[PDB]
Swiss-Prot record, chains A, B, C:
Pfam families: OTCace, OTCace_N. Carbamoyl phosphate binds at S57, T58, R59, T60, R108, H135, Q138, C270, L271, R297. L-ornithine binds at N166, D230, S234, M235. Changing G155R: In OTCD; neonatal. This is Ornithine transcarbamylase, mitochondrial. Disulfide bonds: none annotated. Changing R96H: In OTCD; early onset; decreased ornithine carbamoyltransferase activity; 2.1% of wild-type activity.
Amino acid sequence: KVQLKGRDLLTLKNFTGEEIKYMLWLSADLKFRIKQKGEYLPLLQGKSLGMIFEKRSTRTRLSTETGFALLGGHPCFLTTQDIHLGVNESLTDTARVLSSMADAVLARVYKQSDLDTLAKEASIPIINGLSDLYHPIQILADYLTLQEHYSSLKGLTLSWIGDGNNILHSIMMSAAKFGMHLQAATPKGYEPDASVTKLAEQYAKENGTKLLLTNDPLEAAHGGNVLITDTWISMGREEEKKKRLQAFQGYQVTMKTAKVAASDWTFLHCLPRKPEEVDDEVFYSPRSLVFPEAENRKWTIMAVMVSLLTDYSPQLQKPKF
Amino acid sequence: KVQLKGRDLLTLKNFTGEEIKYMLWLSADLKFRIKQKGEYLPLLQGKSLGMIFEKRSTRTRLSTETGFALLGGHPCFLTTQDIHLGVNESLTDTARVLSSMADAVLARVYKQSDLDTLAKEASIPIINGLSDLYHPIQILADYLTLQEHYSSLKGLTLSWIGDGNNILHSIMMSAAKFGMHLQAATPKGYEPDASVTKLAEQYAKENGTKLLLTNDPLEAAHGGNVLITDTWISMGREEEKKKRLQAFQGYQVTMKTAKVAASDWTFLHCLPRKPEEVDDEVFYSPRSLVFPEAENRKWTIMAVMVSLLTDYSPQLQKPKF
Amino acid sequence: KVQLKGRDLLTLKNFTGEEIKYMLWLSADLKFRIKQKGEYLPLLQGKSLGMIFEKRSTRTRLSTETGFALLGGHPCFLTTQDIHLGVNESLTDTARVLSSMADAVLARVYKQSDLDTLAKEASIPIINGLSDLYHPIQILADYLTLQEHYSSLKGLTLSWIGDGNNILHSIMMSAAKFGMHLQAATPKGYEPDASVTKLAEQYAKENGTKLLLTNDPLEAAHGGNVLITDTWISMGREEEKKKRLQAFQGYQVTMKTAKVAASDWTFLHCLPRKPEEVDDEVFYSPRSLVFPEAENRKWTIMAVMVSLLTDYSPQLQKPKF
């Protein structure tokens, strides 16, 4: 009863829990057949993907490139020195050329509005590879990982400790739909987007789930099942970016932070990780799901591509969510 | 009766109309079977292509990369930071290494002479991906597009309005062979190459077609079926490049320009397009074939590869030219 | 009786002659079936390769990329602007992410220690694409070429004339295992690594082969069957790098150098070649195996991948070594 074929994945805001669940289900299916059973499934044979990156990457680049190729399609890697975007060409014109030459586009851009324009003009699916506002494909990998750990998701309390960035916005746009609670801590002045937050409340209300916003790392960690953080220091090289080193004091996740969380707690980090966000004790702790989380970036982006470009239907039995 | 296998495509100058027609025919065939019938044809399975680019690109890069992969071959993208060409290695040595590692090379270079050297030494086909003198693969896409629009080509009058560049040279090297007339306008001092022009006259003479050279945009557009332009402003950043803004006054194609052309006129632009060459009224006009033109860059380069590397013969019935 | 599957290829130091022979044998097999018989062998279908390059390349990039794709796998090209290595990420973390996303990694790094770390942490094969200490895949191509020329290797005397670099170290780590003699000349102060040399002596002793180290180009060439050189001028742009132009006087291989070598002598150069190491008379001489040597870079890296990632066993009859 889920029809995803042909849709864009710009943000989890537009997907119902039933649809996001279909994608994780497909993720499990694909992982089972390929990784466990060892089968070869050329589901994307004859297809191509335009990967436009305005920023560095490895996790997204690698997972998306090997993933698309693993199903028989051809991934096409493009950067700012390749595209004419911004320099020698409009956006409406680029969306049209791409729409006749690729079957889908995955774009990592600075502005979310650019993805909106792109989708408005393109006639092939547009997938958000990360933007200022959201990073939905990261959340898909996170949930599948949590699912693989706890056997279900409903009821879990996610504790966010870090900046009010794209990861949190994507978590806010989806946690409630899985019946999960969200307790988030961000320094004053680094709150998540006001309109995003306003929508997370409504989701929390419609699904009977908790939504706690605080500036206290420990208040957020308190009672949580999953501790989640992410690099908060800006790449903006500057001895004046100390503001973040000064505003984020007490945010480093350590065993102290875990002391106040649920006993069955696990840890998540989208990577790359630095020694500020979390220490090595928690990070390399057997409670850390960082690496299984990274690997799931591959299976989930594969699932996204398959469900937006094919009619393939899952073999595996629907997982317990 | 057409044997193209193993030949280089450095310029349309060396191909007879019968041969260029074979390529467009193959272009139509491939487009029909893949785009319309949805078949998968691994005609280039086991083959690889070396794509050497000394300059940016998107149209050529994308079309060539997705096109080659769509037929089962592996496209290999190389730039100036990859090759050793110019910096740490000769040309005769590079042609030999490439000849043992790829099945063909597509090169976008600054000098046409470099392609000549390359071909002299390489023992695998060399395809011109654009050079100072010509851009034949662009014309293949143009003609197929015109063919798809008018149902035939013979008799059409092409009106060129712009610089005396590679596109025009390629048009000059091929229009007459299809029985098409050419009326071209270029500012004084920006005339097409003298030896190229001298050859276009001879072709015009051998095929009983018209060849008009003028410095008047309107005299060239007058009576034409297809209005064709192209970016004339140089990337050479300089407030002294105004010479082109001053020499090309009156060259912007607008509805005024169309007022004097045949009633069934269409418009072509190889892209990317800027607001100088043409306005939005003509450019996004329903007479503009810009996008179908861009898409055909894919089907035609595919046809080129297949005819130079395989023995594949067209299923589709030979088109009307 | 040779089990290579799953092993790293960091240096020929850890492989027995029987194992290196298996790889050349597989190289011949693959070359025979694909190049001569024209078969298509998707031995690496469903596999991916992470190619991390910290330095330029063409020979390694091209051979490895077309080679991996020719067997049905997907080669993934990464550079310093792609990876986060060094800038935003540790090495232990990168080895783990790669280990879950690719089936093997080929790395061209500056430090050999980095490959050691990488292998320690990664759980997928690591292949040395060239480092400060060694360049084993280059030697595989050399030996196969010599094998194809002389019909056997045992007994040949290899004469090295150049710097005490990675190529020589790799030659030292393997020549004796094939029963070949090594006479090497390097300027004073440019001797090969002391510990590597110490091990080459032991190999020479265990296989009853000769190992001669001298600072005399002619003493090394004297009686040799294969003259081997390599670019000794440093890329370190500096009118003070003249030290190498001054220390390497008399090292240019010319017909004079060949005058004192065995009558059946051949010449090898890993490329790219400059006019300092060798002149055009020797380089383009019919005794030069430079190009067949370059081509064999493809067949040998293919053999490496197949033997480290599959259970494929050679069809061809074991060659005479």
